[PDB]
Amino acid sequence: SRLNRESVIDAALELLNETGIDGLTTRKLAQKLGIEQPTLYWHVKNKRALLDALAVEILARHHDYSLPAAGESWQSFLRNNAMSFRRALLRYRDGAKVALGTRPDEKQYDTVETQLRFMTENGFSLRDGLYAISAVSHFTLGAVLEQQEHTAALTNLPPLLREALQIMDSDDGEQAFLHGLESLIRGFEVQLTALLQIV
Amino acid sequence: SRLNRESVIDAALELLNETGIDGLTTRKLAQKLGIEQPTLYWHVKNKRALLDALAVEILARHHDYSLPAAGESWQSFLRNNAMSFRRALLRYRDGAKVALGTRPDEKQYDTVETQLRFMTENGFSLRDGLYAISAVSHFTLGAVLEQQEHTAALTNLPPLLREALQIMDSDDGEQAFLHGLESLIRGFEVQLTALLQIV
Ligand SMILES: CN(C)[C@@H]1C(O)=C(C(N)=O)C(=O)[C@@]2(O)C(O)=C3C(=O)c4c(O)cccc4[C@@](C)(O)[C@H]3C[C@@H]12
Ligand SMILES: CN(C)[C@@H]1C(O)=C(C(N)=O)C(=O)[C@@]2(O)C(O)=C3C(=O)c4c(O)cccc4[C@@](C)(O)[C@H]3C[C@@H]12
Ligand SMILES: [Cl-]
Ligand SMILES: [Cl-]
Ligand SMILES: [Cl-]
Ligand SMILES: [Cl-]
Ligand SMILES: [Cl-]
Ligand SMILES: [Cl-]
Ligand SMILES: [Mg+2]
Ligand SMILES: [Mg+2]
């Protein structure tokens, strides 16, 4: 079938959904695409190239709150950005695993530069803004990965743990995520406010 | 060589370090152990059983701050617990990937019950204590996974991003981690303090 970049990526996401990350392979991608393996190699050199591309494209397709609204607070932007990031990572099987350890792509440069500038224009040093952005990224990735890999795994408890497991089993993870997110955002705010005060 | 549980686990961690998680296999474990594959199967049924075991044993061996000190504050316990958790996850290649989505093992029941009880004895509802514990777990896992998978990957920047990448490349990740951790802990504290007040 068609082997332009857009089409190869569509097929790879479809396969990622069916097989997960560890099961995703170029041989299986060639099969899905109805092509021989040397044909594929012309377009896709290895699994890493594919993974890097999929991490960019998953956000390009499903991460719709990458930029703050006009007049939006930094707190609100981090909240909205994190919810959007989480949704995007949850959309394909092992999506968060595909996103791990990637670095900004050239096609994302304008966008993440704006993100970083925004934090600095709200009083953060680049480092402190970066640390806030990174903590949000990390917390969100961890929460999605635990949620997803828990599912992968599924394929005389003491009382508080029993109840804790009931609590976790009662929700997809969004409740704990949204709660932890408010804690994180407010902690950043306390830090930012304090300036040189002992806090 | 010897195939008791302890020995199989030693070999599997050694192999995890050499090959990472996706490359870890029972065939390769059998090779390391100097045994045939049906011999191994008697002791280890599949890769999942091995992964579940390794997640328990990595913490058993290297997570030394699982319990609060006498009179220790909940803030200090979460801090100390998180640093210890992070160190443990960093000790083997893809350690954090091995830990993902696991649930408490029977051998950890006493310990995590104590953790949960401790939070409740400091004023948290079980749910809020759980949400705090989970946010710490998630933030720490995400930060370790990004650090580690970044390394795996390695095998006209705009100015703020250039500097941000210099900042990240200058440290192993501990600085941003410790900073984000204080933000998280203080956010929990603000929440706990507020009780029914609008906050
Ligand atoms: C907070 N939120 C989840 C962010 C986001 O919305 C992104 C996006 N594509 O819109 C990221 O790329 C974002 O998710 C993300 O992945 C970010 C990063 O990876 C980095 C890295 O690795 C190094 C320097 C700077 C960044 C960053 C500023 O681009 C990060 C922004 C992250
Ligand atoms: C915060 N810190 C990293 C904790 C920890 O020190 C643990 C340990 N072995 O000592 C965990 O097991 C700990 O790391 C961890 O993994 C915990 C959990 O997985 C769960 C799950 O999944 C469900 C209910 C309860 C727990 C928990 C209370 O046992 C969690 C405690 C985590
Ligand atoms: Cl076609
Ligand atoms: Cl074509
Ligand atoms: Cl492959
Ligand atoms: Cl021996
Ligand atoms: Cl033996
Ligand atoms: Cl295997
Ligand atoms: Mg990233
Ligand atoms: Mg866990």
**DSSP for A108-172?**
GHHHHHHHHHHHHHTT--HHHHHHHHHHHHHHHHHHHHHHHHHHHHH----HHHHHHHHHHHTS-
Rounded CA Rg of chain B:
20
CA distances from residue B91 to A140, B14, B20 in whole angstroms, order as listed: 23, 11, 12
Q: Are residues B52 and B133 in the same domain?
A: no
Helix ranges restricted to H, A63-94:
74-90
- List CB contacts (< 8 A) between B137 and chain A: 142, 146
Domain boundary among A46, A65, A84: A65
Pocket test residue of A165, A167, A170 for ligand 2, highest count of atoms within 8 A of CB: A165
Q: Are residues B70 and B152 in the same domain?
A: yes
Q: Are residues B73 and B51 in the same domain?
A: no
Q: Are residues A59 and A82 in the same domain?
A: no
Q: How many domains does chain A have?
A: 2
DSSP B147: H
CA distance B38 to B124: 50
User: Is B66 strand, coil or helix?
Assistant: coil
Rounded CA Rg of chain A:
20
CA distance B185 to A183: 8
Q: A101, B151 in Cβ contact below 8 A?
A: yes
Token digits of residue A54: 């999929």
Token digits of residue A199: 């806090």
User: Buried b / exposed e across B24-35, counting CB within 10 Å, b at 16+?
Assistant: bebeebbebbeb
DSSP B156: -
Amino acid at B185: I
Amino acid at A178: L
CA distances from residue B183 to A1, A196, B35, B83, B189 in whole angstroms, order as listed: 50, 16, 50, 14, 10
Q: A93, A20 in Cβ contact below 8 A?
A: yes
Q: Are residues B185 and B89 in the same domain?
A: yes
Q: Are residues A130 and A190 in the same domain?
A: yes
CA distance A149 to B101: 5
Q: Are residues A157 and A184 in the same domain?
A: yes
Q: If you take atom 3 of ligand 1, which residue's CA is the nearest one?
A: A137
User: Buried b / exposed e across B115-138, counting CB within 10 Å, b at 16+?
Assistant: bbbbbeeeebebebbbbbbbbbbb
A113 CA → ligand 10 middle, Å: 34
Residue B185 CB partners (closer than 8 Å, separation 6+)? A187, B75, B78, B79
Indicate which CATH number applies to the domain containing A85: 1.10.357.10
Token digits of residue A57: 């494209």
Domain boundary among A40, A65, A90: A65
CA distance A129 to A119: 5
Indicate which CATH number applies to the domain containing A57: 1.10.10.60
CA distances from residue A4 to A160, A163, A185 in whole angstroms, order as listed: 54, 51, 41
Q: How many CB pairs under 8 A join A and B?
A: 190
Residue B164: alpha-carbon gap to chain centroid:
26
Q: Minimal Cα–Cα distance from A149 to chain B, Å?
A: 5
Residue B76 CB partners (closer than 8 Å, separation 6+)? B68, B69
Residue A188 CB partners (closer than 8 Å, separation 6+)? A78, A132, A135, B183
Q: Are residues B78 and B58 in the same domain?
A: no
Asked if B141 and A137 come within 8 Å (Cβ–Cβ), the reply is: no
Pocket test residue of B64, B77, B115 for ligand 2, highest count of atoms within 8 A of CB: B115
CA distance B73 to A171: 30
Q: CA quadruple A23, A24, A27, A32: dihedral positive or negative?
A: positive
Q: What is the dihedral of CA B84, B86, B92, B96, to 10 degrees?
A: 130
Q: Which of A110, A138, A184 sits opposite B187 (nearest CB)?
A: A184
Q: Are residues B169 and B92 in the same domain?
A: yes
Residue B24: alpha-carbon gap to chain centroid:
19
DSSP A68: P
A32 CA → ligand 4 middle, Å: 14
Q: What is the dihedral of CA A170, A13, A66, A188, to 10 degrees?
A: 50
Domain boundary among B65, B81, B116: B65
Q: Are residues B80 and B1 in the same domain?
A: no
Data resolution in angstroms: 1.7
> Which residues form the domain of B118?
66-198
Best A117, A139, A178 member to test B by mutation, with max B CBs in 10 Å, is A139
Which approach determined this entry? Answer: X-ray
Q: B105, B53 in Cβ contact below 8 A?
A: no
DSSP A180: H
CA distance A105 to A2: 25
Minimum Cα–Cα distance from A51: chain B residue: B153
Q: If you take atom 6 of ligand 2, which residue's CA is the nearest one?
A: B66
Q: Are residues A148 and A127 in the same domain?
A: yes
Q: B88, B132 in Cβ contact below 8 A?
A: no
> Would you say how long chain A is, in residues?
199
CA distance B64 to B85: 8
Q: A26, A50 in Cβ contact below 8 A?
A: yes
Minimum Cα–Cα distance from B144: chain A residue: A138
Residue B121 CB partners (closer than 8 Å, separation 6+)? none
Token digits of residue B53: 């075991």
Phi, psi of B123 (to 5 degrees): 105, -5
B9 CA → ligand 3 middle, Å: 49
In which residue are the tokens 């600095």 written? A120
Q: B136, B78 in Cβ contact below 8 A?
A: yes
Q: B106, A168 in Cβ contact below 8 A?
A: no
B98 CA → ligand 6 middle, Å: 27
Q: CB count, 10 Å around CB of B189?
A: 19
Q: Are residues B73 and B150 in the same domain?
A: yes
Asked if B100 and A149 come within 8 Å (Cβ–Cβ), the reply is: yes
User: Is B68 strand, coil or helix?
Assistant: coil
Helix ranges restricted to H, chain B:
5-23, 26-33, 37-43, 47-62, 74-90, 95-99, 109-121, 126-154, 159-169, 174-194
